[PDB]
Design a binder for these strands. Structure first.
Lengths: 94, 98, 83, 107, 92, 107, 96, 81
DNA sequence: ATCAATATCCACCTGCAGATTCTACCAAAAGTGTATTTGGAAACTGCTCCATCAAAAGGCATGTTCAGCGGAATTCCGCTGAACATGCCTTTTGATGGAGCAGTTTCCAAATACACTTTTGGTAGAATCTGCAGGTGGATATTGAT
DNA sequence: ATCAATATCCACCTGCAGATTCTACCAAAAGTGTATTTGGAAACTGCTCCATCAAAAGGCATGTTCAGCGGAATTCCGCTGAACATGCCTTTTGATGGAGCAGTTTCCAAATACACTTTTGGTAGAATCTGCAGGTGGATATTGAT
């Protein structure tokens, strides 16, 4: 038939770095998928508005950052920004 | 004859149901209601098993939270019994009535 | 004349169980018909949006995605069935 | 020699995918090079945060496989995740144990 | 240069109430109202199209959008004016 | 020859061209069919007509010729559907409907 | 020397204020509060006068709606006087 | 700039309760209301100012406040927003 | 305090539904190299409007007295919901045709893309106009003491 | 019920700020008119998975009794609404200098646009593994009566 993408394999890989001996049921994996799609939409959507308000054609990490600052609660935001900045820096230095 | 005083069994049920996660409305009856309501919007419809399931999950979660707020309004009234008045006041402040 | 109207299928014992989960200890008799009313209004709002999604896709089967999307519009986002 | 952008950013999440999803999502005419890296880093981090707490919840119940109840207990017992998911229902999650004090038997 | 629906709002005002005016603060609110409904419908349309793997927004998505967004009677009349306008537009 | 605007072709007061333009620039999809703007301009025109119809009445009822914000507020709050469409909207300088709970009245 | 009973003037005020739409918080005082809160967030910030007005129009409409819910909560307690326990219940149910 | 929360004077909070349909007010309502307003304003100004900065501006605009209110579900009509 | 009826725990057990490891085929990704295009920052700067100081005056905030009345504590009566055992009618579960959700393929109406030509909605600056705010006053409630 | 002290309704009326009203410029819009690309309706069909039916399964409806709680009534102390005196700080009217936003132009780092090669995540089917849900047992905490 066709294909049905899901974040499952990635969710699973991260589960291992955190709890190498812990598992996760199917229904739970579905919640995590729902969770990842949900945050994605919220962050992208916000980034989208930011660009439009400022009459910009491009969504740069700058927009993803401000979106994060606007959507995530304090500490969560603090770290979220941190991880994001690190990933770009590293990606560049390569 | 052994008899539990009023409230002792209810309190037991609150402890039990807050620990579990199973749905509490019987499925078939729920399914019948869902389909009925649907029938007024469009005839001859079919429902994926998982769609009915999603609706029950959403409905129950919704009612369980409305009951929480209702208890709070009853207690505000200095009662320990939820009444129509209390569900009414909570839905109103929730913006569901206004 | 039979034995039950459909909304009456949501029963006292079940409504009680819900309340229990919501921490309610003592329930007034009139609460039962009151709860059914609220449940009916809640399902009408969601099923209507979901079915509007079904027609738009020219289908005759309501899918979990149609409910999940209606739920999200009504601000009642549900995780577990796509989301 | 072909290396994935995810490895370059040093992330487990699909950077190539997030990029594809940003473009198709009609969020903007254009999508910068670093935005997908960043957005995938944020997605990964939040994913670790919830599994980290749910894992613990699994341990507290003498269980090794995380289920919905474990994710619900993780989110609602955490002020911040609870806020982020304030208008979200986790299927098959139940509620936190809680009984208003005045409904308790007079000791 | 900054556009607004002021002149159209004004024309419409003149059809329903030929002898009534509108203060600027009220026009401002009317401009807000129109831009608000616009984003709400288009957005609804946008998602609608995506959910169905369609890359085009047509009079048909706008119509479902209108049905999901507006309450009962208002939709009934909105859908009418909308169908009516497209049919009339298509014959020229 | 003669060049008729798309609005007149649709029998509309609202600007079909503008709406079409706004639709594309707002990035809602890759493509925007010709009917979309016609239909949207029409729904937008119908809604402003209904509210002006009602605000104009509140003006007249208060012996005024010029509609102000309070007139828009009264028309909206007194209309069940417009009240819901705008259930989460604040109309600046709109005030509130007069309303006093019964237990607060004397005698 | 003529004296209206307690509550008569309060009812007079409700009818008066529910009839008009002017802002009720003094303007200058409200602006200093805005600048103070904003400042403790980021320094050297400037404000367009309409920006302070929009914050004020929103703030007053938010508090007025809050007082209605509070008022409902107090009456639900068989009272006619709003108290903190009432404002708190209205916000707890609102999801605040 | 120190203690401006007291500019929201007892009289002004009373007028607001009135429009709100309130007949009798307890003495402790005034400090509670100031608290409520402070959080409300904190959240709106926080988001508004985030918009200012993302645009590398030093001046908070009406649009900044209007987009901030829409983020929080308190859509306001009348100032461009 | 003294049992006595039950509910709740805990340590151990084992079968199976759901989790897992495994190979393979593969279209759809995702990465890579080249050519062309452009969004938007650095740079210069015109021009709106924001902060600010000045001054006058009255609207309105503050502080007080005084007593009416309401929050809330306490007592209380009947009414009504919790508990419970009693008896079966409805829900749940596992099994079977076929109705539609889809994958695939075709082909045209309709949507880009691009070049001109043409109508027009803003607006910079005017001068003229009109609805109503706010002051005045006297006819008409609405309140509260007696 | 009558009466005095206030507040309120309200139509008439004049000053002014805010609204309607051109005159002229116009570049950004919108429209007309070939040429090129293609999205997705439409027709056909294959394989799920959904509606339905039988039967093994496990809740719910029903009447009795009584204890406890909703809410009516009573009471009192203190606190909150009126009314009032005093004066200050908001508000209103202006002018001023400048920071900072927003228009315009030049130009390059980054992004789009194929085209080609490699890889990888989702699917299908087959087989073996395993975390835990109930089910037992016996100990013990809980509850309610005496």
């Amino acid at each position: 038939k066709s294909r049905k993408e899901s974040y499952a394999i990635y969710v699973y890989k991260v589960l291992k770095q955190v709890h190498p001996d812990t598992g996760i049921s199917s229904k739970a994996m579905s919640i995590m998928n729902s969770f990842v799609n949900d945050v994605f939409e919220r962050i992208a959507g916000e980034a989208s508005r930011l660009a439009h308000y400022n009459k910009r054609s491009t969504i740069t990490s700058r927009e993803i950052q401000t979106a994060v600052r606007l959507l995530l609660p304090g500490e969560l935001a603090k770290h979220a920004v941190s991880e994001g900045t690190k990933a770009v820096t590293k990606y560049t230095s390569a | 004859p052994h008899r539990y005083r009023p409230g002792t069994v209810a309190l037991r049920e609150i402890r039990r149901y807050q620990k579990s996660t199973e749905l509490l409305i019987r499925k078939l009856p729920f399914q019948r209601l869902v389909r009925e309501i649907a029938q007024d919007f469009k005839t001859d419809l079919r429902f994926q098993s998982s769609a009915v399931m999603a609706l029950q999950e959403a409905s129950e979660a919704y009612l369980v939270a409305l009951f929480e707020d209702t208890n709070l309004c009853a207690i505000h009234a200095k009662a320990v019994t939820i009444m129509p008045k209390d569900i009414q006041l909570a839905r109103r402040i929730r913006g569901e009535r206004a | 004349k039979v034995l039950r109207d459909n909304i009456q299928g949501i029963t006292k014992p079940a409504i009680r169980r819900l309340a229990r989960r919501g921490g309610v200890k003592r329930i007034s008799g009139l609460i039962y018909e009151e709860t059914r009313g609220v449940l009916k209004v809640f399902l009408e709002n969601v099923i209507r949006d979901a079915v509007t999604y079904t027609e738009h896709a020219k289908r005759k089967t309501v899918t979990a995605m149609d409910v999940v999307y209606a739920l999200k519009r009504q601000g009642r986002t549900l995780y577990g069935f796509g989301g | 020699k072909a290396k994935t952008r995810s490895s370059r950013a040093g992330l487990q999440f699909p950077v190539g995918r997030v990029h594809r999803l940003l473009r198709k999502g009609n969020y903007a005419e254009r999508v910068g090079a670093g935005a997908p890296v960043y957005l995938a880093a944020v997605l990964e981090y939040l994913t670790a945060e919830i599994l980290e707490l749910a894992g613990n919840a699994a341990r507290d119940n003498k269980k090794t496989r995380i289920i919905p109840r474990h994710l619900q207990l993780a989110v609602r017992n955490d002020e911040e995740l609870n806020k982020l998911l304030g208008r979200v229902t986790i299927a098959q999650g139940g509620v936190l144990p809680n009984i208003q004090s005045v409904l308790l038997p007079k000791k």
